[PDB]
Design a protein around this ligand. Sequence first.
Ligand SMILES: COCCOC[C@@H](C)OC[C@@H](C)N
Ligand SMILES: COCCOC[C@H](C)N
Ligand SMILES: [Cl-]
Ligand SMILES: [Cl-]
Ligand SMILES: [Cl-]
Length: 348
Amino acid sequence: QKTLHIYNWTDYIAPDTVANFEKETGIKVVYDVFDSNEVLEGKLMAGSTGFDLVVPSAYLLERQLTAGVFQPLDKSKLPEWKNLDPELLKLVAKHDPDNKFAMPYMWATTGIGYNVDKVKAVLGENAPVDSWDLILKPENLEKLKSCGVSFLDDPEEVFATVLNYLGKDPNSTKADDYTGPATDLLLKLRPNIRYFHSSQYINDLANGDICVAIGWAGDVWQASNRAKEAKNGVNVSFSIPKEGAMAWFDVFAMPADAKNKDEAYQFLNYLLRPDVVAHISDHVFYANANKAATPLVSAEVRENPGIYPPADVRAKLFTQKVQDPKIDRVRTRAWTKVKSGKLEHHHH
Ligand SMILES: COCCOC[C@@H](C)OC[C@@H](C)N
Ligand SMILES: COCCOC[C@H](C)N
Ligand SMILES: [Cl-]
Ligand SMILES: [Cl-]
Ligand SMILES: [Cl-]
């Protein structure tokens, strides 16, 4: 009896995907979840993860590729590899040259999830829901504070979006941009932010407890769908704002010390089946990287331009760059300062 260990993002598979695989193959799956690239990266770099498959973002795979923590994926054991969109593979290959290490899973953007009616109640019918002004202009956050504001607990995403909003390179390599203007804005916003968290905001949006969030697209569409299924009268939407936004791929990868490689390839090949991955997209509201699967994805998902954005929106999207250690230090320090920004100090 063989057992396959998988480590994936929360809210990123259909409820029955694993059970269906277990029934088909007789392999027992131990499925665990994370909501942060930082948590996964730490485990990959500290020692053995004990996992057979993990799901980093592509830029994280790129950041640690030369550290040797992943092993190359034997495409002879992935007969359905051909189902992946070959043009999307060329884009992922910027992170994974010649697609040696990573299987593209889903693609999306980092934007604003919001309660349509509460935002309009607080900011008016002309609330700037097509703009980062909705959540990064202090005058707006002051008005939204009590209906609840959340930011992702992701320093790379948050600093990049703030830098872009301030008219800087979202991937600036200038330390002063982080310690100066980006920190200045974040500290002005901080008193109005209820929490920094990368997964609680889904149910909080769905239930009406948070009115604006920095969020990942499909997470927000899941919140919208949860509210609809609950018949709770809450209207959640998502915006890829006009100033641009981060875009990203998440990918499956195999840790270099994986125990059960054969079973892992069986699971990857299962995910390459068009019906399997389209069913996932239908439940998690994320675009997959499987060309063969597209016709099977629900119309509600395929036709949503916040899931599959058109070319004029894609032209405004940017990709996360891996930063040098000095920028990493200054960004991480600034993040800790921002998150602790409400605490009282006694040094004056
Ligand atoms: C409305 O269908 C769009 C078809 O897109 C091709 C698929 C394979 O790529 C999805 C991208 C946007 N992650
Ligand atoms: C990659 O293909 C999707 C094309 O969308 C382009 C829209 C019509 N502006
Ligand atoms: Cl409410
Ligand atoms: Cl990425
Ligand atoms: Cl449909």
